[PDB]
């Protein structure tokens, strides 16, 4: 799976 | 809110 | 173009 | 009451 | 760029 | 409306 | 000595 | 004179 | 982490 | 200051 | 020459 | 160990 | 435009 | 407890 | 700082 | 005539 970051404060992975 | 990244040069923030 | 970024692991380009 | 600000971005209030 | 502030409520940044 | 915010000091808002 | 910010409105200084 | 302010990194007073 | 801000002057950020 | 980036995985600030 | 990244806020780059 | 990013083009880890 | 709705708490409106 | 939504502007709890 | 040009006859900066 | 221009500092014209 792929994981995209977003700041949401820490930077997350979305993971997809 | 969220905010993803791009480059776009020079890397960019979206706010979602 | 936008060029997203994505762990793939390496990181990997998206591009749009 | 006081608010108080911080950058978390957005700038957010603290109610005090 | 210079990034001033306003109450707009929410304190935001405006991009210069 | 805006608020900018100054100092005028003490802060003041100009109001917009 | 440091001075931090509140609504209180006026924006008034908190000093320490 | 009004200060205002802005960051430029740091945040810096603007006299007028 | 938040950010605060103080008069120290110049305008400073505390990092919590 | 500037803040660079690292991987700690969660990413994670470093400033300077 | 290697590129890094740095917020600074718009993320800058530092090249090597 | 932290994990850096740099540009080299591919984005590449550089571990420490 | 159409606006979406995401609790981020409190309800938000997302403009498209 | 129960949570109905108004619209009041901002979308908002009314906690019961 | 942002510096602007004007013609001024002799070409000056306007920096802010 | 042509009026070029360079930073010579000071912005000067250059005359052809
Ligand atoms: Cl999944
Ligand atoms: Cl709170
Ligand atoms: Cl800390
Ligand atoms: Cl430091
Ligand atoms: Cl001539
Ligand atoms: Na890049
Ligand atoms: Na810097």
């Known amino acids: 799976a ?3 970051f ?3 404060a820490a ?3 979305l993971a997809v």
Do not use: C, K, N, S
């Open 6 to 8: 977003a700041e949401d």
């Open 11 to 13: 930077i997350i992975g």
């Open 2 to 4: 792929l994981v995209f």
